[PDB]
Amino acid sequence: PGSIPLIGERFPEMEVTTDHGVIKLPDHYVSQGKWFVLFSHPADFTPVCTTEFVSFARRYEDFQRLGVDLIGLSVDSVFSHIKWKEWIERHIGVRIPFPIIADPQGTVARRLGLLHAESATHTVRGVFIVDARGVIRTMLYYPMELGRLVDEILRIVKALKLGDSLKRAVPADWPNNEIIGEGLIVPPPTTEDQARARMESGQYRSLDWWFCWDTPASRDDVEEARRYLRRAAEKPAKLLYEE
Amino acid sequence: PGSIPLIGERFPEMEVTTDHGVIKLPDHYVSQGKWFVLFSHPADFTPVCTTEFVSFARRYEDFQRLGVDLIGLSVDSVFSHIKWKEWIERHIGVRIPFPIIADPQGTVARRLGLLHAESATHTVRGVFIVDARGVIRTMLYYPMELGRLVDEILRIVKALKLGDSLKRAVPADWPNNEIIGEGLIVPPPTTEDQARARMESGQYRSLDWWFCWDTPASRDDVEEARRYLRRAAEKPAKLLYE
Amino acid sequence: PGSIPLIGERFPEMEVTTDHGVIKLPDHYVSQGKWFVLFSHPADFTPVCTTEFVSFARRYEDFQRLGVDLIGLSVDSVFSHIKWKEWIERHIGVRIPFPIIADPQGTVARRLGLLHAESATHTVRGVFIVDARGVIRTMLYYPMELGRLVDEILRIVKALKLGDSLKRAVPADWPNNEIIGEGLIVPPPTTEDQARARMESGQYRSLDWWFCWDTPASRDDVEEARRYLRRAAEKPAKLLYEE
Amino acid sequence: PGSIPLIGERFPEMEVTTDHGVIKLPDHYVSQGKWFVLFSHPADFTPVCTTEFVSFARRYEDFQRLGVDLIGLSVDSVFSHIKWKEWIERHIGVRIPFPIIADPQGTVARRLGLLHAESATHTVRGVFIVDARGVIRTMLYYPMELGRLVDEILRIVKALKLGDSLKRAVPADWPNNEIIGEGLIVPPPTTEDQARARMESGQYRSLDWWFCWDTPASRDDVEEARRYLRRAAEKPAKLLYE
Amino acid sequence: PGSIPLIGERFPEMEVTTDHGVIKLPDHYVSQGKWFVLFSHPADFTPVCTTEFVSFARRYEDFQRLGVDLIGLSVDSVFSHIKWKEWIERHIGVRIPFPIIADPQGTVARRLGLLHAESATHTVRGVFIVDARGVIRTMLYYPMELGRLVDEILRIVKALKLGDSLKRAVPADWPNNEIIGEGLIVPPPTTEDQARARMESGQYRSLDWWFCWDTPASRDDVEEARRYLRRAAEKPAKLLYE
Amino acid sequence: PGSIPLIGERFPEMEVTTDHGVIKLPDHYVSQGKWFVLFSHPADFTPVCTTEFVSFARRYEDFQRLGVDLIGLSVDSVFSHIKWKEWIERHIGVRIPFPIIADPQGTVARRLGLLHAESATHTVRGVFIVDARGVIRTMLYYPMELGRLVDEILRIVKALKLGDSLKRAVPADWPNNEIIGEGLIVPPPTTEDQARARMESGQYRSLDWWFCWDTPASRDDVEEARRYLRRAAEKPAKLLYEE
Amino acid sequence: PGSIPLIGERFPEMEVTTDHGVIKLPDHYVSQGKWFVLFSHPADFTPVCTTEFVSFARRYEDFQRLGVDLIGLSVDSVFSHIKWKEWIERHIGVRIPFPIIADPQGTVARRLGLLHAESATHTVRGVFIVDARGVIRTMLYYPMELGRLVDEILRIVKALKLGDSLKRAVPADWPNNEIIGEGLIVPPPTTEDQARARMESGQYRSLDWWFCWDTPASRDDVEEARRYLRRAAEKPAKLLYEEA
Amino acid sequence: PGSIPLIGERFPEMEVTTDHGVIKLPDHYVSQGKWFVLFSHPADFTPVCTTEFVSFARRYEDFQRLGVDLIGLSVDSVFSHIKWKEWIERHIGVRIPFPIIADPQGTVARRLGLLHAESATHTVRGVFIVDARGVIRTMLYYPMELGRLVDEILRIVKALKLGDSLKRAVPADWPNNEIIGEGLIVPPPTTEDQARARMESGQYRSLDWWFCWDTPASRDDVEEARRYLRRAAEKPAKLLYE
Numbered sequence A, C, F: 001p002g003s004i005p006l007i008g009e010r011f012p013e014m015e016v017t018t019d020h021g022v023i024k025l026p027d028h029y030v031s032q033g034k035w036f037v038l039f040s041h042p043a044d045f046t047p048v049c050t051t052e053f054v055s056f057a058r059r060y061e062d063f064q065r066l067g068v069d070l071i072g073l074s075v076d077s078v079f080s081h082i083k084w085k086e087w088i089e090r091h092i093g094v095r096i097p098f099p100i101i102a103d104p105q106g107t108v109a110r111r112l113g114l115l116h117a118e119s120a121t122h123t124v125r126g127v128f129i130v131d132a133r134g135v136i137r138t139m140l141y142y143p144m145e146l147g148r149l150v151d152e153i154l155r156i157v158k159a160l161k162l163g164d165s166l167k168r169a170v171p172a173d174w175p176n177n178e179i180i181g182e183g184l185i186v187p188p189p190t191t192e193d194q195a196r197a198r199m200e201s202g203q204y205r206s207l208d209w210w211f212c213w214d215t216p217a218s219r220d221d222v223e224e225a226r227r228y229l230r231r232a233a234e235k236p237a238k239l240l241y242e243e
Numbered sequence B, D, E, H: 001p002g003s004i005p006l007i008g009e010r011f012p013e014m015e016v017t018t019d020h021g022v023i024k025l026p027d028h029y030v031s032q033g034k035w036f037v038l039f040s041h042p043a044d045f046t047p048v049c050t051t052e053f054v055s056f057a058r059r060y061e062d063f064q065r066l067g068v069d070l071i072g073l074s075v076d077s078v079f080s081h082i083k084w085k086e087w088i089e090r091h092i093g094v095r096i097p098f099p100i101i102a103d104p105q106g107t108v109a110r111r112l113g114l115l116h117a118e119s120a121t122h123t124v125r126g127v128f129i130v131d132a133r134g135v136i137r138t139m140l141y142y143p144m145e146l147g148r149l150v151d152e153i154l155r156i157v158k159a160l161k162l163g164d165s166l167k168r169a170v171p172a173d174w175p176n177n178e179i180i181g182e183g184l185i186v187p188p189p190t191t192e193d194q195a196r197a198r199m200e201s202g203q204y205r206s207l208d209w210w211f212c213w214d215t216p217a218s219r220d221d222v223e224e225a226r227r228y229l230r231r232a233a234e235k236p237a238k239l240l241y242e
Numbered sequence G: 001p002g003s004i005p006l007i008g009e010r011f012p013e014m015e016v017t018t019d020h021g022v023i024k025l026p027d028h029y030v031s032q033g034k035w036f037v038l039f040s041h042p043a044d045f046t047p048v049c050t051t052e053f054v055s056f057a058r059r060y061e062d063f064q065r066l067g068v069d070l071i072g073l074s075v076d077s078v079f080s081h082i083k084w085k086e087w088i089e090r091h092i093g094v095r096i097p098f099p100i101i102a103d104p105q106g107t108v109a110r111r112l113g114l115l116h117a118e119s120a121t122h123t124v125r126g127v128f129i130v131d132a133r134g135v136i137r138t139m140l141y142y143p144m145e146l147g148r149l150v151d152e153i154l155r156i157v158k159a160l161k162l163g164d165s166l167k168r169a170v171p172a173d174w175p176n177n178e179i180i181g182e183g184l185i186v187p188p189p190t191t192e193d194q195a196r197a198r199m200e201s202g203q204y205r206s207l208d209w210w211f212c213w214d215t216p217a218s219r220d221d222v223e224e225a226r227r228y229l230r231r232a233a234e235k236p237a238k239l240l241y242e243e244a
């Protein structure tokens, strides 16, 4: 009952107005060889959205370290976006550095399938993780009542880049997988002869011909991914509302 | 693009064949007062899928305690499903307790929008969080090459149930939000008079009329949620491969 | 081109979300015996729009005295509306007392034909004058770059109400028409026998059988309308920017 | 409902028969570098219509001063137009100098959306303000029972021409705006860096980054515009009926 | 009802994924001058299917000697196919040497009309005999509950090849037809003059002008076909379950 | 590129003209509790067709023994059918006892999908096995140049009936299956619990939970089915053309 | 209702399989300058059909003499056709010399509109008389229960051929018309001037300007046509059933 | 091509205007238990048509004897019909006793498929033989240039009536058939059993089981039918033009 773009599809070509100016997607980022996370929120000057913008802003350096840009999206105007950013900087002390798309009319929202059944008027909390070829790699749809876990978005992008670079699949809960820990998975053989050869080689740790794995990720890759989860799990030292 | 069910919609009505038998969704779970997490995986006898089933199985009691059940889905047959579960129990030592839908033909996958552009033949790693009214609450679409973080699925369900119960919205990264910690958010006023009254009352901690919050969650509820995230962050003491 | 509701049609039946709550148009006003002026503006936190809201707010008691309510409309959210009203109150010292419809998505805007070729995303400066039967009586379409003359909106509603009550048509530039001054026009005869009879009566001042008029508006009603125009022509002695 | 031309659109290309001859719109005016006001009226030999033609005629030189031509429109014939003009000149003592389109069958009226619900048979009192590029800049729809305020049409054209030449937006009620008087508005910044730069410049009087203004209009332009409103507000010295 | 390819039509052009790799049909075989038998089965890890694979495996050299390749098909994955082959080799001691198409989603099954009314989800037991020109020559549709007689598939291909090379039609039950034994049938005349001439020629053994036959097949070819049938009728000396 | 009825579907309801009279299918046989084999042939007075009718006629008592009726079908007239039967009895010494549908215009042929790319005008050599509930159980399509093996049709109907009666599946090449000989297969479990319960019972011979079998067929069932194959493989003692 | 080819139309172009082989209609006959009579019958090995084949066979020389070929048609196969012809030769002693189209599936039947409401499965007894230009000239539709009068088919072809060569219309019951006998009709004038000029010429015998005629047919042509009708009226001296 | 009514169909229900008045077909005749021959002709005051009308009128009594009415049809008016009848009676001395349908506009002609490729304007020479049940039994289509053989129309009606009453089929050229003379045919058996029974009964003269016949027609019926053909073949004693 709603159409969405799909993993493995190129991100829909569109021109969009942001509070940093007008840009073409995905080209703006593709043409710079950058991945991007496009996310949406229902409304400027609402509380869960504000908490998410602050969370993304605090993690901005972490996204930058991965060569990943951030871009928001709501049906509010650019004037709203700029006022809301002023409010956040003034009252919370956090500067939001990344652009937000202004989509009054919801033209962009409809193209991304962001209008669900909770609201006719405001987008859900969608997330599109897009690589440097402009291909959609992961999509999340959280609802208006539930803020995202932004560290899982960092883990997703990091693990996708790692997987691409090492030609490996990434196990559940990586880098803390219960079977293979920080190990990464060799894509399984797809022919009988390949399956036989793989075994006869003795090259990898293995549970069966279709489950081979090794540990090609650097300590830095592993501990940075693990850091995101540690941060997610840690009770904050000092809350921002206090000051 | 492709067609999907949407957040806020009733889960589409369907009869499905699982390796535990034939059931009707969402009625089977709604009838038991249960939420369910329906998730898909590309293929039995592939490694990332295997690690995810092991992670869900390990967390199964945690889901049960929340009144949530689990049901998998792939385009493999029930015979495949039963053999794969045999394999996992024998070789990894973990019994998978929950059903898996067998969807050869991809009838169910098409209804759910689980066939994306990565593969013509196998589903992506989709997740539908469905409440006890049978209403879809959250949807996640991970790709073939990346396993899920199952503790986040627990966090999502725990947070949604708390929000529903306490009549509150849940901030980014809860229960470790950097602005309000384990605080929960009062849904914002939608009229000028409501905004003025809310402020005049002095009832809540507030940054503005549209940003009020309090700390209604029990210590037990907060600690349960933090436990999910602590587990996610911790390197396992002993790996099951060993 | 684009589709609009038309003069003499009942105002399109619709439930709308305002910063005062949800209401049904035109019933909300019809059931109170009120006329209403529904006007649109392109965006909250934009300058021409702000000047118009201040102008309408200043004239609010004039509308209320006539039994006319005001209701605004833009594609911005209720949260934006409330924040904008706070800003106006705090910085200009003027409280905006009337509701504004929040139309993110442009559902109401499309229905009303308020999306023109200047902007794909924000409404024009439309005005619908709706009577207490819920019928559209006059429509104005001003562009983004040009603020309305709000005293002409008062003159329109005053003159329409007078014409309705007195069963009279209203000459150009009334109450200062160059031919008949504050005079009002008797609707012309539509048959030959009616035309001949009207002339035979000698009941009215007349230029021909189709042009008869009299002076049935009260001194108070004439002066009220004259006051609107004198205000329009008068330079404020003190400007609100000054304080 | 019904279709109409829209602000920002080029005025619909058409040949029209007037009581001055056949002309092509908007080309006839565009080729002369002139704006035009096209207005309609329900019917020749009706009283409100007559008062409006007299008002436009009285203001003809003011439109000419601005480089704006006038053209009327009704569903009556050219024969009716010429007879009605004779009548007005003889009985009111006013010559109507501008053309009126004759549109029996409402072909042109239908194209411009001038047939509304109050009459199936005669046009409403429409006004299209069209610039020298042929683009529709403002549209007004008054009803058959209420005559226009012609000085507001002058104010509209004057203010639009001023906005275009000075690259400024025009506040409500200009030149008597209650916030900034005869000031004109700088179109607001549309990016965060532009907003910051404008504030740092100190170039403009301002209430916020989105509300900057100055006073670039000449005294002549301001007083001209104010004079249209003064005239609107003035009780006539002598009535033409007398 | 449902749509199927037809006898005399070229086998539907398609790329297919097998547990040996990706191949294009019918080209892969045509380009080698080989016939192929494409057969389907409902599900890996089911018992009738397993018996059939072992039957084809036992006969694989007989097919090879005729210049006929074998290719299987079900809606299971390549991973299932490889695991199932492993199981058969380990438990039955038979290595399945030929590829099996993996058709999850049932794209190929639909194109070949292999989804019938007994199951929405798994194919029937279809057999397509395809010659070296890519043309479909015979089609069989057995049901889930009944295994094929693989020696009749050998008899069919052997008999079609003989009929093609010798320009003869093949009688019921050949090479053991009750009327003419191992005899082969001359295609009947289709005109009066042709019928008259055939009779006047006295060239063939004959029961009437439209029923003429001779014995052109070699002793080797006849004996080969008889051997298929003798094997079908013989109880195995040693059962593989033992 | 052609429509056919499908296994598991009720045989298409139709009234047909045979050389024995008009009957309704499948009702005619269902009402008697009989299975039937409906087979088609391209043309009367052609040689492969004649050999198949003689083969069916010779095996007629074997079909009768199983409670199975035979019915033929071609696009020829009833007159052709009767003449052809006369010819076969006179010239081959064999009486054809079962009816043949006359289908000029190919109405029935089209309903059964019996017109393939080999001939626009004459039916292929189709075989429909239909049970006593009127359901299609197996379909075979042989071409014009290749006669059927009628003993396989007998083995099919015998084995289907046997599987129905005993609630068993039938292995490849039964009763001479290479793995289990004359054994019959228990339909595999379709749930985990059913799979484990079957294994714990120790009720059946078994290679895995999904491969259990037993030997419930009588020696008479087994030896009758084997006899069809033995007959198929036997060189005829005397040829009918000689006689 | 049902669709049929029409008089004045070229016969529907088609390849047909006959018991003489595959030929193209009407080309096969047009190419030889021959007229043809295509006729249909419901079924081989049925009695009215058999009587009509024997009638056409007996009249085959008369048709050939006129440059007219015969071709039959039923929904039966070529094998049936051949066997039926064998039966007729053996039991009646008459060889059928002309081809019969085999139309199982009724493709040709449908195209010629030969399937009526009597039967869904077998053709009616249609007759198409087709000239050397391939044009349909006359169509007859007899029912299953009633055999044709074959001598009327000869009379039709003879008279149309005469009309064509002599530029004349042919009166009712020719050559025994009650008004003008073996006379043939001048096609009527279609304009007033042409009508007036015909009468002023005194060229023809005439009852009015629209009814002029003469006697341009040879004694041989007239007697040939009369012979067909005399044969139709005569009871055979010896019946073929007798000498089986 | 063009559409026509079919043998075995009820004659199209229609109201038609004749020179005798308005009648409903086929009901007018069905009501009387009569058969009818409806025939058409291209045009009144044309010569072939005139000869045919005279031939029908001469045979009127023969049709009446059989209980068969005649009705003509052309696209001419009733006024033309009456004038033409006047002409025929004055100049030929023959009264035309039966009605002719007047069909200007060709509404009936179109309905009966009587407009062929020879003429866009006038009907062919069609003949419908319709029984007392209103059912079309035979149709003939002669062209503009060739008059009908009216005695064959009598023979058709007589023979169809005889076949109906005696439950027999009628051989070619009856009552002068070259195989069986005035014999009539028993409709052939349609089952094997029926074929065998008929042969074993010895009831009928026969050539084979499918060719049985007898002689059930009275001498009166046979000689009457033969007389139609004798009349057709006879050179007229005196020509009416004389």
Ligand SMILES: [O-][O-]
Binding pocket: A042, A043, A046, A047, A048, A049, A050, A144, B169, B188
């Ligand atoms: O966002 O609440």
Ligand SMILES: [O-][O-]
Binding pocket: A169, A185, A188, B042, B046, B047, B048, B049, B050, B144
């Ligand atoms: O799944 O790897």
Ligand SMILES: [O-][O-]
Binding pocket: C042, C043, C046, C047, C048, C049, C050, C144, D169, D188
């Ligand atoms: O509004 O500027």
Ligand SMILES: [O-][O-]
Binding pocket: C169, C188, D042, D046, D047, D048, D049, D050, D144
């Ligand atoms: O115009 O009144």
Ligand SMILES: [O-][O-]
Binding pocket: E046, E047, E048, E049, E050, E144, F169, F188
């Ligand atoms: O296959 O059971």
Ligand SMILES: [O-][O-]
Binding pocket: E169, E188, F042, F043, F046, F047, F048, F049, F050, F144
């Ligand atoms: O049948 O050959």
Ligand SMILES: [O-][O-]
Binding pocket: G046, G047, G048, G049, G050, G144, H169
């Ligand atoms: O044919 O009877």
Ligand SMILES: [O-][O-]
Binding pocket: G169, H042, H043, H046, H047, H048, H049, H050, H144
């Ligand atoms: O009719 O000539």
